[PDB]
A = this chain, B = another copy of it.
Amino acid sequence: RFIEVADETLSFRQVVMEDSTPNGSQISAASGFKPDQMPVVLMLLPNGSLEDIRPDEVVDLSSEVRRFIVVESDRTYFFTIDGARLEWPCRFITGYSIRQLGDIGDNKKLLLEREDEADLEVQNDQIIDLDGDGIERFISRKATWK
């Protein structure tokens, strides 16, 4: 078997799986993490959501080549893209990572929802801090500027 494993840089690499039905611990071990590190493993669902894989949660790999994000972290932050919830192990996320996670086309404009002022436009290299209180909400609009 083969899986694709990435990190906060979202650069997937081939990892050999000897078990067709591994749990989170086996996926973490195959990615190069010791059992004590216990990294956060997020499986990419076909629809677009991210499913958290527990260290004892068995995943069936016989379906297709599934993708995982394995990042050594002790917490996860929740944000939303067009109302769809997504999970990120780090507190700082770039606009490029948001576009990759949300599968937002390059012909659209990414915005951060605000209430006290106009929605903030997020560039590819702009960094958004997820540690702020509340769930950060992101929006995709047509690439038009007034």
Contacts and interface: CB of A to CB of B under 8 A. Distances in A.
Secondary structure of the A contact surface, majority rule? loop
A144 to B, nearest CB: 11
A22 to B, nearest CB: 9
A118 to B, nearest CB: 5
Contacts of A35: 55, 82-84
Nearest to A50: B54
Interface in A50-83: 51-52, 54-58, 74-78, 80-83
Interface residues of A, number: 51
A127 interface: no
Interface string A12-48: 0000001111010110010000111110100000010
A52 B49 contact: no
Interface stretch (A3-11, A92-100, A133-141): A133-141
Interface of A: 18-21, 23, 25-26, 29, 34-38, 40, 47, 49, 51-52, 54-58, 74-78, 80-85, 111, 113-119, 130-131, 133-136, 139, 141, 146
Given A51-B54, A75-B78, 4 more contacts: A18-B58, A74-B78, A113-B113, A118-B118
